[PDB]
Amino acid sequence: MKYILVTGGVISGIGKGVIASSVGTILKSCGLHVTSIKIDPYINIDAGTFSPYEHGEVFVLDDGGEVDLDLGNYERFLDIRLTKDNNLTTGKIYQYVINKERKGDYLGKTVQVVPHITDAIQEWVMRQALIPVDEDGLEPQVCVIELGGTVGDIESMPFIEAFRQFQFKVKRENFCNIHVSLVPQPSSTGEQKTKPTQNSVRELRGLGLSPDLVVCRCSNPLDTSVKEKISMFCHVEPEQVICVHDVSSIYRVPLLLEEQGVVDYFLRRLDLPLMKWKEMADRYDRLLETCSIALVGKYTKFSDSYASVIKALEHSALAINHKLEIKYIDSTDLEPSTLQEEPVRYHEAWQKLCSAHGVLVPGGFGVRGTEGKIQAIAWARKQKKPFLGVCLGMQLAVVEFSRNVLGWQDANSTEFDPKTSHPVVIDMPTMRLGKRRTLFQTKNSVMRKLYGDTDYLEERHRHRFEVNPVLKKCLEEQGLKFVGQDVEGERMEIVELEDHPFFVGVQYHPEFLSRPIKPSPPYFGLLLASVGRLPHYLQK
Amino acid sequence: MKYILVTGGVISGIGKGVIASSVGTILKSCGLHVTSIKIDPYINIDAGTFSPYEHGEVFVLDDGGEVDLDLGNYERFLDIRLTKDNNLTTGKIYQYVINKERKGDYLGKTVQVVPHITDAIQEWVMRQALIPVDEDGLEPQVCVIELGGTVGDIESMPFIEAFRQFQFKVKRENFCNIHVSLVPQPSSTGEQKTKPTQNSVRELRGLGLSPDLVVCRCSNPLDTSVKEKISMFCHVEPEQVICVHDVSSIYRVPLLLEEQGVVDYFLRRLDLPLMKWKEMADRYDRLLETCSIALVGKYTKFSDSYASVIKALEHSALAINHKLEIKYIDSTDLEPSTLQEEPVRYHEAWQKLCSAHGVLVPGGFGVRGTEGKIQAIAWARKQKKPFLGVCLGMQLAVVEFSRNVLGWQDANSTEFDPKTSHPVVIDMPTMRLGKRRTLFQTKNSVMRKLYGDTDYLEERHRHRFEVNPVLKKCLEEQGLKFVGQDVEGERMEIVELEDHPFFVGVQYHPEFLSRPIKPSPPYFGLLLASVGRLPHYLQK
Amino acid sequence: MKYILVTGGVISGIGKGVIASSVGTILKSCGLHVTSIKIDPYINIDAGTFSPYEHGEVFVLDDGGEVDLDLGNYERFLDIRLTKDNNLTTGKIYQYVINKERKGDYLGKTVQVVPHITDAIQEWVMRQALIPVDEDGLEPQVCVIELGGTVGDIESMPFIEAFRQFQFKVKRENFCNIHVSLVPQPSSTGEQKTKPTQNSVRELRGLGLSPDLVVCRCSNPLDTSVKEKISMFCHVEPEQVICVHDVSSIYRVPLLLEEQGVVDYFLRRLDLPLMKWKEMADRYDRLLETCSIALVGKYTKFSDSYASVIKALEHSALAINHKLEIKYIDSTDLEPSTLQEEPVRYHEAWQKLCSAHGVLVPGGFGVRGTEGKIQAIAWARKQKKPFLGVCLGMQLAVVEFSRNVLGWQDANSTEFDPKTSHPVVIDMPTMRLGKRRTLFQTKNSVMRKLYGDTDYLEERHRHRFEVNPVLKKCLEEQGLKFVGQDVEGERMEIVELEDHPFFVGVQYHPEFLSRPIKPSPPYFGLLLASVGRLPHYLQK
Ligand SMILES: CCOc1cncc(-c2ccc(C(=O)NC3(c4csc(NS(=O)(=O)C5CC5)n4)CC3)nc2)n1
Ligand SMILES: CCOc1cncc(-c2ccc(C(=O)NC3(c4csc(NS(=O)(=O)C5CC5)n4)CC3)nc2)n1
Ligand SMILES: CCOc1cncc(-c2ccc(C(=O)NC3(c4csc(NS(=O)(=O)C5CC5)n4)CC3)nc2)n1
Numbered sequence A, B, C: 001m002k003y004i005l006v007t008g009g010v011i012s013g014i015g016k017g018v019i020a021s022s023v024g025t026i027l028k029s030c031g032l033h034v035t036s037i038k039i040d041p042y043i044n045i046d047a048g049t050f051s052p053y054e055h056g057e058v059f060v061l062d063d064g065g066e067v068d069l070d071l072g073n074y075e076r077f078l079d080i081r082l083t084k085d086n087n088l089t090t091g092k093i094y095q096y097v098i099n100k101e102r103k104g105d106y107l108g109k110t111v112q113v114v115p116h117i118t119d120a121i122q123e124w125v126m127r128q129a130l131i132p133v134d135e136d137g138l139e140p141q142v143c144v145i146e147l148g149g150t151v152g153d154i155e156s157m158p159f160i161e162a163f164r165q166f167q168f169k170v171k172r173e174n175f176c177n178i179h180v181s182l183v184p185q186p187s188s189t190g191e192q193k194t195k196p197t198q199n200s201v202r203e204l205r206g207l208g209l210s211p212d213l214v215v216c217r218c219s220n221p222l223d224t225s226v227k228e229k230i231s232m233f234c235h236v237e238p239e240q241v242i243c244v245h246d247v248s249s250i251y252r253v254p255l256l257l258e259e260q261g262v263v264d265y266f267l268r269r270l271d272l273p274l275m276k277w278k279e280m281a282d283r284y285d286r287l288l289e290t291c292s293i294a295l296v297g298k299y300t301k302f303s304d305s306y307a308s309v310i311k312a313l314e315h316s317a318l319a320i321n322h323k324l325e326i327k328y329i330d331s332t333d334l335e336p337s338t339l340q341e342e343p344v345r346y347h348e349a350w351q352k353l354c355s356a357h358g359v360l361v362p363g364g365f366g367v368r369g370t371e372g373k374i375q376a377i378a379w380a381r382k383q384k385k386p387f388l389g390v391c392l393g394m395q396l397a398v399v400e401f402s403r404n405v406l407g408w409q410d411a412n413s414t415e416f417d418p419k420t421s422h423p424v425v426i427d428m429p430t431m432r433l434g435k436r437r438t439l440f441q442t443k444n445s446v447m448r449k450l451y452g453d454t455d456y457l458e459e460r461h462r463h464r465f466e467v468n469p470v471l472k473k474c475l476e477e478q479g480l481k482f483v484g485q486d487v488e489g490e491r492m493e494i495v496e497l498e499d500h501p502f503f504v505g506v507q508y509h510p511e512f513l514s515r516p517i518k519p520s521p522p523y524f525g526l527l528l529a530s531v532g533r534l535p536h537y538l539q540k
C-alpha cells in the first residue's frame, strides 16, 4: 500500500479536499485503485451531531455513515463507495483505545497518547486502506489521507506524530506528505506572501514530517521569485512547489496539478508503473444557453450547507449543455412574517422564485423556513414550474397538496405540528439512514424512465419522518401518485403529481449518488423540464 | 474555593505527591478544610487495569475507586476520605465529553479540545473541589490539584491549557501554581544544575502558567548562587525558590516547607486568615529498639508495589517505639524450583525469613510466588512466628492450613488450581471492592480487642475470591476460627488460629485506613506480637 | 514613560507601520508627547546597504541615519524628528554587546542572549524613549515600539523575550502590547478566517506576551461571529478586538481606531489623563479636478521604492485640491534598446510620459534607466512640461542640458561614464548624508519664493556625486542658474532653468520633510505648475 498524507497549513477551506481528490483522480488515471481517508481531528464520532452551518452538509454513505463533505468529494472524483471508518476522528480513536483499555487488552500497562493512540491511528489507516471501496471489489494500491484542520491545531498533534512514526514503519517509497498552504496577496503591497507557508512548513518539520510537495493556494499564478523563496525557506526543490491558482472550473484543477508534474513526482517517488476532465472544462467554458433553479433552502446562510445538492444541479446543467443560475433563497424570506417585518427581502426572494425556471426544495430538520418551502411548492404546483422536493421537500409537498386539494388547512408533519388533526407526515423509525432499496410501482412514472426503466432503485436515505399510510389513499385519490415505495410497502419513497411537467418528491438524497458522467436522475429531470426538453428526452 | 496546582517539571518520582500532601497538611494546620485532586494524564479510566509494577500499588477508596497511590498520600497526610472523581484522567474526561456529544448536549457544534475538553477539566475540578472529603462533612476551602507526569508530556497539554484559562475564570487570589522540579548534582563537576529547572519553567510559561513557587528537588541543600540563578533564569523572587532536600524522615518534609515560608506565601497569596510532625520526627530519629518483619511479596521487584503496606508497618513500628527492618523477600525465591535453579537466592530468602520476628504476606493476583507465600505461612505457623496474611495471604493461609491439618495436599484457590478436589477458596462475586462492614462473631478474638472491642468493623476490600462456606466447618473444627464475617454471613473476612501468639488472616486491606496517629490494628498487633508485647497490650 | 509594543502576526505589509503611527497620532491628539522606535530584527546595522526593492525606500534622518520607511511614517503622522537609534536592529544590539564584552564590561561572566542581549534591548528602549524627538524639545510620555517581522520569526525571539521581562521591570500601567494580525477572507468559502490570528496569538503567549488589543487586518468589516470567535480563541474581550478594514484614504485609519475605542482603551490602561484627519479625508473623497505626474523611476518594479516621494506628491495634490494620477514609468522602457527589443512597452511608457502634465525624475544609484531619465528630462525641457529632478534627476538634468545646449554628447556623471571628456557631475565626498544647510543665491528664484522667501534652507541629503565647479559657468552661461548652493559654495544644491514654467533640480530629498499640512515646496511647485496655477500662487 502507498500512502499520501495531505496536511493543511494556514487555514481550512483552501480547497485541500479537492486537491486530495485531484491527487487521487490523477493516480486513478495512472491505472491505480485509489482509496481515501479523511481525518477530522474533532472529538465528534460522526457528522450526525452537526448542523449544515458547522462544516457544510452532512454527507451520507451506503452504510449510514453521516460524514464530512470531503468524503463526497472523494466519491465524486474517484467513483468509489466509502464506509464510516474512512472518516477517522479523535472521538473514534480515543473511544476505541478506552474500550480496549477497559477490556484489559493493553495488559495492565499505562495507556498513553504515544504509543497507544498513535499506534491506533496507524492500525486504523492500514486496516482501512486495504478495504475495497472501488465497485470493482479490488484492494486499493494508493490511500490518500487528508488531515483536516491545520498542522498547528492541538487536535492534529497525535495524527502528525502517528504519521511521523508511520514514515519509518512503512518505507519512504510507500509514504509521501503533501502540504496545502495559503499564500496571501495583500492589496497594500501587491506581493505574494511566503511567510505563513514557511512558518507552517517549519511547524510541520518540528512535528517530524517534511513536505514532499508544498501546494500553494494562491489566487493568481505564483511569481518566480516567490516560488524561489518558497524553495529556499521551505527547504524543498522548485519541482516540489506547486501553485494551485484560480481557474475557470473545478475540472481544471487536476489538469493544473498534472501540468506541474505532480503525476510524474508521485510515479517516481511512490515507485509506481484526464481527457474527460479536459472536455468537461472545455464544454463548461463554452456554455451559452442558461437555466435557473430556485434553491429554497433553510440553511442558505452558508452555501456549503447544500454542497452536493449544488454539485448535482451543476452535473445536470452541464449534462444538458446549459449554464446554471442557482437562485439561493433563504426560505424564511418567503414566510409572511417577513412581509410585515422586512418586506424588501420578502419581495426580493419572491422575485427570485418567480424568475426561476425550476424550483428545488432541499432537505432539512426543524421548523424554521418550512412554511416558506410550502409557499414555494404552492407557487410551483399552481404555476406548473418544474419541482424537485428532496426529503423534507417531499414531506412538505404532500402537506402543501393536502392543505389545498383536501382543504386540510391544519396539516403538517408531526415534527413541526404534532397537535394537528391531519398528521400527513408521521415519525416512522431510529433514522432510516444509508442505502435501502425502493421499488417502482408504475411503468408510466417519469422517474422510472429517468432511472433507466429499472424495477428497483437503491438510494441513500437520512429520515425519521414518512408519509402517513392511513392518509395515503386520500392524497392518491386526488391525482398524487406514490410511484416509489420501500420493499415493505409501508414507506412512500417517491411521489409524482399528475397534470404537471415535473412535480416530483423523492424521500431520499439523490445528490450523494450524482457524478459528472452520471447526473442524479431527479436533478437531471428537473433541469430537462426547466428547459422544456423532458418530453423530447422521454420520447427518445 | 482556593486552588493550588502542583505541576511536575523534569521527572516523576521526585516526591511531588508528598510535596502536594505537605502543602495540604500545612494549610490544614492553618485551620483550613483541604481537599485534593490527582490528575493522571493517562487514558486509563482507573488504576484497576494496572499491575503494582506500573505506578506502584492500586490504592482503594471507600466507593471502590481503584486509584493512584498519591490519593493514599492525600488521605494519610490530610485525614480525608476521597472518591473516584478525585482521581481525574484523560480517559474520564474524553469519555465524559464523547458521551455528552453523543447525547447532543454540545448542540451540533464541533467539539474540540479547546474549549470543550479544557472546559470539562475546569467543570470537574470546580465540581469535585466543593465535595466534603473531610469526615467533618464541611465544604473544602483549598483544593490542591497535583498534575501527574511532566509539563512537557503531550498528555499534560490540555490540563495545563485548562489551568491557563482557569487562572482568569477563577481570580489570582484563588489560583496558585507550584512547580516541582529536579536539580541534578553530578559527581563530575559537583555543581547543582539549574538548567533542567529553567527549561521546565520556560516550557510551563510557554503553556501560559507562571510558577508562583518553584520547588527544587535537590539531594543536598541549595547553594546560594544556584538559588540566585534559579531566581534569575526562572524569573521569580528568591522567596519563591524552595529546596526540598533529603531529610531524616517524611515527618521533616512539612517542617522544611514551613521553614522556607511556604505557609506565609500561601496565606498571603491566597488571601487566607505542625508539632505532631515535629514529635513524630524527633521520636523516629531516637529509635534504638528494632523489630524485623518478613514481607513475602509477589511484586517485591519494585518497592512501591506495597507502598501503603510498608507505610502501615512503619506507623505501627513508630507507635510501638521501635525501628523497623522490613525484609523484602521475592516469594518466587522461596519456591522449590529456585532451590534447583538458583539455590543462592533460595537460601538468602530463607535466611531473611528465618531471621524475621514477624511474617507479612501481602495481597496479589496470579499464580507466581503463591507457593512461596504458602511456604512462608507454613514456617510462620510451625515456628509460631507472628503472622499477618492480607487478602491473598488470608486465602493462602486457609489453603496452607488445610494442606497440613486436613491433609488436603491438592488444596488451593480456584484462581490457581481450578481442577483441585479441595477448592477451599472459591470465586464469590464482580470484585468485592471498596468499603463494606464486617461483623465480629466472638468477644475472645484478638482482632476484636485490637479494633477497640467494637461489634463491627468497616474496612476496604478488593477481592473476587472468598473462603468456601462448605469447607468452613472442616477448617474451623481444627482450631481455625473465622472471627470476622460479612453482614450476610456468607463471606469469611477475618480468621484467627488457636495456639499461636498472632496468626491472623484479614480478607480486606487494613493498610488503606492506616494513619501515623492511628496504625491499622492488624499491622499493629503483628508489630506488638513480634516484640512479645501483645499480651501486655491486651492485658492493659 | 508609557510603552506600547506593536507586534506583527501572520505577515509583514498589513499596514502595521500605519497602525503604530495611527496609535501614536491618536495619543498625540490626547495631548501626549509621543516618540516611536522601530525594531527591525535583521542583522543589517542600517538600511544604507539595501536596494529600494528589499523593504521599500531608504528613508533618511537629520543625523544621516539611513533607516526603514516606517520611521518616515512616524515622522509624517507625529511631526517628530528621529535619530539612528530609533531604528533598533539585531546588528546594532549584537555589535553593542560584543564591543562591551571585548572592553571587559561584563566582568568575565558568560555573555548570553538572556540576559545580556535582552537587557541591552531594554536599556536601548528606555534610553531612546527619553530622547526629545518632538521639535518642542520636551521628554516623551509614550513610546510606541513597532516590532517588525512576525512573532514566529527566529530573529524576533530575543525582542519578544526582552519585552516579556520588560512588562515586569516596567509596570502593567506602563506597558501594553498590540498584535496586528491578518484575517484572510478566501473566495472559496467567503468566511473571514480567525485561524492564523489565534495561532499567532498562541505563539505570542508561548513567548510570554498577551495581546492587550488584537488588531485584525481585514479587507471587509469584521463579522460579529468572527469577532466573537477571536475573543474566544485569542482569549480577550470583544472590546480588545479591532478590525482595521479597507477605507477610502489613509486619513480614515486613525478615525477607524478612534471609533473602536482604542483611544479610551489606552487612556484607561496606561493611566493617562482628529478633526484635521476628518477634513483631509472629507476633502480627499470630494476631489474632482485631476493632475497627472510622470514618475520616471529606476525602481518602479515595486511601488514602495518611491514611498515618501509618492506621499509628497499626494500631500501636494491634496493641498492644491486636485486628485492625482501618478504615471509610474520604468525608465528602462524609455531607453532606445527597448524600442528594438520590445517596442510595445517603449510606446506605452512614452504614451504615459507624453500624457502627463508634469515630470518627476526621482533619485537612484547605478546606470540602469539613467538614459531613460535623460530622455524624459529632454522631453520635459523641450515641450516645457513642469519638471522636478530629485538628486539623480538634478544631476542627469545638468547632464541632459549640457548634451544639448553645450553639444557635449559624451557628457555624463563620473558614476556612469568615468571615461567621459565632460564629467559635468563628479564624486565630491563619504556620502553627504543627513541634514545640511543650503543658501539661496538669488531673490528671483522660484524655489526661494516657494520656500517662504527664506535666505537659507535645511534639507536632507544622500549623495556622493555633485555638479562639477569647473563646468558650472559653462552651464550657467546658457540660462541655467544654480540658485541654491552649500555654505562652502562648492556644492550646487538647487538648479533652475530660464524660459520654462518650472524646471527645477534639487540635489537633496524634499520628500522626507513633506507633511500633509506642509507639502514639500519642490513637489508643491511641480503640482501648481502642472495645473498652471504657479504664476497665480507666486503673484499672491
Ligand atoms: C484547490 C482548488 O483550487 C481551485 C481553484 N480554482 C477554482 C476552484 C474551484 C473549486 C470548486 C468549484 C466547484 O465546486 N464547482 C462546481 C462543481 C461542479 S462538479 C463539482 N465537483 S464534483 O462533483 O466533485 C466533480 C469534480 C468531480 N463542482 C460548480 C459547483 N469550482 C472551482 N478550485
Ligand atoms: C519531596 C520529598 O522529599 C523528601 C526528602 N527527604 C526524605 C523524603 C522521604 C520520602 C518518603 C519517605 C517514606 O515513605 N517514609 C516512610 C513513611 C512512614 S509514614 C509515611 N507516609 S505517610 O503514611 O503518608 C505519613 C506522613 C503522613 N512514610 C517510612 C516509609 N521518607 C522520606 N522525602
Ligand atoms: C492598516 C492600514 O489599513 C488601511 C486600510 N485602508 C486603507 C489604508 C491605506 C494605506 C496607505 C495609504 C496611502 O499610502 N495613501 C497615500 C498617502 C497620502 S499621505 C500618506 N501618508 S502620510 O504621509 O504618512 C500622512 C498620513 C500622515 N499616504 C496616497 C499615498 N492609503 C490607504 N490602510
Ligand SMILES: O=c1ccn([C@@H]2O[C@H](COP(=O)(O)OP(=O)(O)OP(=O)(O)O)[C@@H](O)[C@H]2O)c(=O)[nH]1
Pocket (backbone or CB within 6 Å): A011, A012, A039, A040, A041, A042, A147, A148, A149, A150, A153, A155, A156, B110, B111, B112, C192, C193, C194, C195, C196, C229, C233
Ligand atoms: O477539514 C476539516 C476537518 C476538521 N476540522 C476541525 O474543525 C475545527 C475548527 O477548525 P477551523 O480551521 O475551521 O478553525 P476555527 O473555526 O477556529 O477558525 P476559522 O474557521 O475562523 O479560520 C478543528 O477541530 C479542526 O481540526 C477542520 O477545520 N477542517
Ligand SMILES: O=c1ccn([C@@H]2O[C@H](COP(=O)(O)OP(=O)(O)OP(=O)(O)O)[C@@H](O)[C@H]2O)c(=O)[nH]1
Pocket (backbone or CB within 6 Å): B192, B193, B194, B195, B196, B229, B233, C110, C111, C112
Ligand atoms: O560546553 C559548553 C559551552 C558553552 N556553554 C554555554 O554556557 C552558558 C550556560 O550554559 P549551562 O548549561 O552552564 O547553564 P546555566 O549556567 O544557566 O545552568 P547550570 O550550570 O546551573 O545547570 C550558555 O550560553 C551555554 O550555551 C555551556 O554551557 N557549555
Ligand SMILES: O=c1ccn([C@@H]2O[C@H](COP(=O)(O)OP(=O)(O)OP(=O)(O)O)[C@@H](O)[C@H]2O)c(=O)[nH]1
Pocket (backbone or CB within 6 Å): A192, A193, A194, A195, A196, A229, A233, C011, C012, C039, C040, C041, C042, C147, C148, C149, C150, C153, C155, C156
Ligand atoms: O517591518 C519589518 C522589519 C523587518 N523585517 C524583516 O525582514 C525579513 C523578512 O521578513 P518578511 O516578513 O518580509 O518575510 P519573507 O520575505 O521571508 O516572506 P514574504 O515577504 O514573501 O511573506 C526578516 O528578517 C524580518 O524580521 C520585516 O519583515 N519587516
Ligand SMILES: NC(=O)CC[C@H](N)C(=O)O
Pocket (backbone or CB within 6 Å): A362, A363, A364, A365, A366, A390, A391, A392, A393, A415, A462, A463, A464, A465, A466
Ligand atoms: N434529510 C432530511 O431532509 C430530513 C427530513 C425530516 N426532518 C426527517 O427527519 O425525515
Ligand SMILES: NC(=O)CC[C@H](N)C(=O)O
Pocket (backbone or CB within 6 Å): B362, B363, B364, B365, B366, B390, B391, B392, B393, B415, B462, B463, B464, B465, B466
Ligand atoms: N487484593 C488481593 O490481594 C487479591 C486476592 C485474590 N486474587 C482475589 O481476587 O481475591
Ligand SMILES: NC(=O)CC[C@H](N)C(=O)O
Pocket (backbone or CB within 6 Å): C362, C363, C364, C365, C366, C390, C391, C392, C393, C415, C462, C463, C464, C465, C466
Ligand atoms: N540619492 C540619490 O538619488 C543618489 C544620486 C547619486 N547616485 C549620488 O550618489 O549622488
Ligand SMILES: [Mg+2]
Pocket (backbone or CB within 6 Å): A012
Ligand atoms: Mg472554522
Ligand SMILES: [Mg+2]
Pocket (backbone or CB within 6 Å): none
Ligand atoms: Mg552553568
Ligand SMILES: [Mg+2]
Pocket (backbone or CB within 6 Å): C012
Ligand atoms: Mg518579505
